Amino acid sequence: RREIKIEGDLVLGGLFPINEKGTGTEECGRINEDRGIQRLEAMLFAIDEINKDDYLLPGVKLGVHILDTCSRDTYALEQSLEFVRASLNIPLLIAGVIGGSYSSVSIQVANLLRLFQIPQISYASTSAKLSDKSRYDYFARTVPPDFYQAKAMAEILRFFNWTYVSTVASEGDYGETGIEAFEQEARLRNICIATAEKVGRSNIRKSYDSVIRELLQKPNARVVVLFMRSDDSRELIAAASRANASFTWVASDGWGAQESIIKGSEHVAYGAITLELASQPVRQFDRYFQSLNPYNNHRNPWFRDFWEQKFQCSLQNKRNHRRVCDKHLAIDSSNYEQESKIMFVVNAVYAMAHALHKMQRTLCPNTTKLCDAMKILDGKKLYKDYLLKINFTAPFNPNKDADSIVKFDTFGDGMGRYNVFNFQNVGGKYSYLKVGHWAETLSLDVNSIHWSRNSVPTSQCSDPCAPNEMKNMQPGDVCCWICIPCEPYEYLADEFTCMDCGSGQWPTADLTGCYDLPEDYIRWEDAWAIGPVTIACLGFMCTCMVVTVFIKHNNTELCYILLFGVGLSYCMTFFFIAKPSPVICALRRLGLGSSFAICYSALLTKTNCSPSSQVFICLGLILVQIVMVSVWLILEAPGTRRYTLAEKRETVILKCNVKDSSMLISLTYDVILVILCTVYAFKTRKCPENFNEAKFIGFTMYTTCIIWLAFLPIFYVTSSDYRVQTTTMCISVSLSGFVVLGCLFAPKVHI
Amino acid sequence: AKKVLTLEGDLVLGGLFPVHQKGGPAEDCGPVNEHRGIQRLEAMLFALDRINRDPHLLPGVRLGAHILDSCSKDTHALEQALDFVRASLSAPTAITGVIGGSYSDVSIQVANLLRLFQIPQISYASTSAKLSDKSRYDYFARTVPPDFFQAKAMAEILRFFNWTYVSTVASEGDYGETGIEAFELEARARNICVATSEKVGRAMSRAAFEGVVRALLQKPSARVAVLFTRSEDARELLAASQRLNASFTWVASDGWGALESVVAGSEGAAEGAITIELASYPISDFASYFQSLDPWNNSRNPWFREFWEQRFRCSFRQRDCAAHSLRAVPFEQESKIMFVVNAVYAMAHALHNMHRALCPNTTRLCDAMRPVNGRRLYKDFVLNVKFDAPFRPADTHNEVRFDRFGDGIGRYNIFTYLRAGSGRYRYQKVGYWAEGLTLDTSLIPWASPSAGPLPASRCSEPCLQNEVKSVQPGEVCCWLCIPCQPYEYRLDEFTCADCGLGYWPNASLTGCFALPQEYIRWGDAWAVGPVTIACLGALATLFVLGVFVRHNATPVVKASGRELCYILLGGVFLCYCMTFIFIAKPSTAVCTLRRLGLGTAFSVCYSALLTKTNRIARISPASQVAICLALISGQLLIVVAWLVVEAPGTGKETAPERREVVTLRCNHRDASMLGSLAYNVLLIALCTLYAFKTRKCPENFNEAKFIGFTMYTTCIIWLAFLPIFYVTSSDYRVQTTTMCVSVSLSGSVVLGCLFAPKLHIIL
Ligand SMILES: N[C@](CC1c2ccccc2Oc2ccccc21)(C(=O)O)[C@H]1C[C@@H]1C(=O)O
Ligand SMILES: N[C@](CC1c2ccccc2Oc2ccccc21)(C(=O)O)[C@H]1C[C@@H]1C(=O)O
Ligand SMILES: *[C@@H]1O[C@H](CO)[C@@H](O)[C@H](O)[C@H]1NC(C)=O
Ligand SMILES: *[C@@H]1O[C@H](CO)[C@@H](O)[C@H](O)[C@H]1NC(C)=O
């Protein structure tokens, strides 16, 4: 409990964790060799250089005032009253405070200092709570917060195309706040978490083993995002050693590049990506620090205590338990290492020096050897104006690459530069090697990855579907999508269910590929209807021969009328053509019905035995009825059948959908009436002709009646298609023509 | 010169009473505030004197006072409050407990300073929402309600009068911005939303006020406005409203309160205004103890001299500052005086409870509590005080309690602005809001049921329960109502449910039970004649057969076919009977059976005609009868089979101006009757063709002429009626009428032809 103090025009405050936190009666016990002592001389070294150099505050001497905090909230808070007691041992005003290595310690000091308008810059505080300027108006950091660590790993997953990931955390401010930041960044970049959970401080292997087992049940995620401290980091690796599996670890600053994390379990941690803060070593500081001895370092009171603890020797009042310190003893590089945050401490000291120099230059134009009116200091002008807007190169830069520029953002947070460390096996010996950097955009070296590019783990949920054959549905989580197959005869849907085009459309690779591709009465007539047509053609040839001999004979008109009906029926089969037409279909139906009517009515005159005029008049009535349908709006253009239920690629329309429906009913009614009259008339007549003629006339009547009766069920069960519809019509008309010609030509041939 | 009011005691209590006014920039602490600084300081002094003497509250421990000033400033308040912890960080005296800064910024700064140093604070007068946040101020308590409890009171009073469409007026800075957000959020649950969330700045022009009043007037259906403004802002707003002749049922926050100066100069435009003020009562003991003080009596107060010099224009050199009575002088007690003594007594109760729970050995303050900690006191004793308020009226009951957020209980007195019959304009109390709302509705004449109350709903819904179609996003507060279409029903209040287009919904708008129809609507046109003809046809058959029976034993009848005559008579009776019974209620086996029999009956007549002309044309008789019987049986069997298979009966027109048709199973009989009609037509056509070649021999008393007449008549009637039947099939009513006429006409023609043989037999 002492205080470094050096008189000067301006003095900078100091708060360092010189003594580690203790318990019992003593508030703080052993001295901190690295966090406290090493950072103590770094600020003293930096402040000494400022005075020596004439390019920064030439006529202004910067003082020093450092107070121990012992890593305790209550003790550090009560030690900050000295910096404010003189703003109302002679008290002296404090220009600013450069201290605070623990987030809890800095929070307590920031709350007290913000009320009294005293700017403060911390050198290691990475808490996200201090980023809320509403609660802490006057606070700045030379180190990035924990927000950027989540952002850096968020871009890592996007760069490696990792979407299905598992996140873990730890109890405390670090684990809880860090894991929340990752979720916000992942939402914008489209990364979904899996089995997210947190671990406690119970330090029980049973709980840790349960966490490891909880990763086993989810094998789609082989990458684990770590937001836990170094204390329990080794425990999880040790826990993961039992029942080992394959996992990829994406850790944070807690793991870092420290080799103490892995101890005999370097197989489960293989191929792990860890983030560590970038910190170049300071060459000048090493020479300065090694030249410190208790003989001349009277300013630092804690130096004597540090020497006793580090060397386990006593300088004054040495007892027999502890040997007296040997002479000519100095610290050397054999057992000395640089603290990871030395450059941050130096930058913090330079931040006020540059800010004070700028404020001195402006508020004291053409002045030196102290200032004018720089006795009372305004926090708002110095901090919010002349401290947040700072851009100067990092002092003592080993390479002067100019990439490291000390500046403060809108919230006062320092620039965020991180290092991506990859864990790999080289020469059979595991080691850490940096494989990239993260200033503002993630940069990675693919070639720098060794023995880990063989697999390139992905851990991706919902591998994209192919909309051509299966559609997409919404699962329980929006991020993942499931493949659902839809029926093949509907067009592609981008994200929704496949909408149905209708009937007769065949979708293709295009999204709107489905279109009307109707068939034109698919040519099954060559296989099916050709036979009846060839038979009909043979009948037509026989009819032509029958006509030729009848024409040659001159009374050796009734035969011509009967022959005309047979000839008209012959072309009925050829009337049906694959080419669609709204007039040919109507004409073919009317012609077929008319031909049957005249042929059937021809035998009516023979049974009754002037008569020619009546037959012609009766024939005209049948023709008038046939053309009566075409007069109305019954006729229409052919259209594809609505066979939505049937899985037919193409639709064929040949009957116009209005002709066969109406003509078949009309033709059947007309045929039935004439057939019934002829049958009754034949029986009533007492054979008013030759014996052969009477038998032939009677036999012909039964043949047409039997054929018409047999064809009646065929019409109902035709199921009009490209083949059955044409075959049924051709077969039925062929039988009627042959029967009429068979019973007429045969009696003439015999006689 | 800074001065401190200090008293020696075992436990000392801090103080930050703003005795000195802020003043201008030149004078940091100029005028002395007597109403808010001196009066409250004397109230605390009286409370401390009373608590010291009374042997029931910390009986042994004596309480001291360390009272400072804030000068209505934040930095000065922090500088003065630094002296509180100058002894408790480890002659200066340890200070435990302070009584707040009597402001918002001052109290916030003091709480922020004392949170880290563990010193409890109980502000007697501080109403802010920031201080209610425990994350930043976890050691702050107050005996006054926060600024969001009056929002609860105003929302509740708006709900009581069924007012939901309101316009909010805000103010610049604190008390005008935070209150609006809390009021809106609380009104979201109560289905109340803003209309014009207009804000008024601190330096806001008069013509600008007129423009804002016109902006308020832009909404026609907004007769109620809630005001969150300061006193002078409200005064200017009422002045502008009076100039523009705009009247509203003003609702105001604590800023208006019951102050007469706010309404003074703007009477007439503020009638019916509703205002709420913090509940408080005068203290007789403090009033007697403040009036029992003159400058030469009290020394303990350093600022008492300045208060005396400010209040009376005399001077302490030599002047009236020694002859001034101060007795029977116009004096008024500040509203927030009881809060100071309540806070002091709460601190005393907390300290007494701590001493009892930590030093139970002797009444003397034990040494075990030497390390005083604010955390334990605040968590256990400060926040768990439940005691009757000191000096409370006997009739009323008051208890000082703190909530989980450190805020005191809320009690607001609602005020109304009246028109006295003989007196001037003045305020009154009509209710209070402690835990539940209560008002005297009949007390207010303006806001009375008879004096034209203003709902100001802006979405009045006088639509009937069956005529609501409120389908519009609009505002969640209310929506417009539209009557539903007659074709639809109001089954659901939100959306009209068009369950059926045919039936008209009933009064309840839930009976979607369809609309029937009747086929028994007898009338002079379609029932008087058609029914008589069908009945007459059956009767005519009875008369015809009577002649035949009497003429049966006659040589003439022997030549004619007896079976043919009987078959024809039976067919005529059968067809007439079906037509007569056709006017009946349809069912599964009534309408379908009747129409099926009619087809068979018609075919019987055709069969009878066929067997009556074949014999004449030929010139075994049993063969013709058997053939005709087989044809009739075959036709009936084909029809009968079709009933089970392809005779489905259903039909109703619902969409176009129609209800369910009056039919059970004879709805699709047209398709079924097509086969029967085709067979009947073919039989009729065959008979006509045979009759053409028949009648060659005029035998049987020229009976062939009668047969030929029937063929030329029945076929002509059937052919003529065929287009009518197809046309009439579109409408069920027309089809039924035509069917009965056609059946009767066919029977009449057959009956008429057979009349001639009857006449010859009779004569
Ligand atoms: N700034 C640190 C970061 C610290 C931390 C770092 C890594 C892993 C866990 C972890 O725990 C938390 C939790 C909350 C806030 C900060 C941390 C600090 O301790 O405050 C670190 C510079 C201080 C030092 O020990 O040198
Ligand atoms: N707490 C009060 C209330 C005050 C206030 C009261 C009425 C109208 C306007 C108004 O302005 C605001 C704005 C924000 C918060 C509080 C207030 C204060 O002055 O802070 C008042 C007890 C203090 C006293 O009268 O000594
Ligand atoms: C990630 O996916 C992109 C395409 O979206 C591709 O260009 C890139 O090469 C991928 N990166 C990998 C596989 O590492
Ligand atoms: C408010 O509406 C309710 C309806 O539930 C009614 O009972 C009450 O009387 C109304 N209050 C008025 C009109 O002041």
Author numbering:
A (entry chain 3): 30 to 117, 137 to 604, 613 to 665, 684 to 825
B (entry chain 2): 22 to 111, 132 to 660, 675 to 818
Recite the paper's sentences:
Upon binding to the orthosteric antagonist, the two VFTs in the mGlu2–mGlu3 heterodimers adopt a similar open conformation with a common dimer interface formed by the top lobes. Each of the three cryo-EM datasets of mGlu2–mGlu3 in the presence of the antagonist LY341495 yielded two inactive structures with distinct TMD dimerization patterns. In addition to the lipid-mediated dimerization, two other dimerization patterns of the TMDs were observed in the inactive mGlu2–mGlu3 structures. When bound to the antagonist only or the antagonist together with the mGlu2 NAM, the TMD association of the heterodimer is also mediated by helix V of the subunits (termed as dimerization mode II). Unlike the previously determined structures of the inactive mGlu homo- and heterodimers, in which the two TMDs are completely separated with helix V facing each other, the inactive mGlu2–mGlu3 displays a much closer distance between the subunits with the intracellular regions of helix V and the intracellular tips of helix III forming close contacts. Extra rounds of cryo-EM data processing excluded the existence of mode II in the heterodimers bound to the antagonist and both NAMs, as well as mode III in the heterodimer in complex with the antagonist only or the antagonist together with the mGlu2 NAM. An increased proportion of dimer was also observed when a disulfide bridge was introduced between the intracellular regions of helix V in the subunits (dimerization mode II) or between the extracellular regions of helices IV and V (dimerization mode III). In a bioluminescence resonance energy transfer (BRET) assay that measures glutamate-induced Gi activation, the crosslinked mutants displayed a notably reduced maximal response (Emax) compared to that of the wild-type heterodimer, indicating that locking the dimer interface in the inactive states impairs receptor activation.
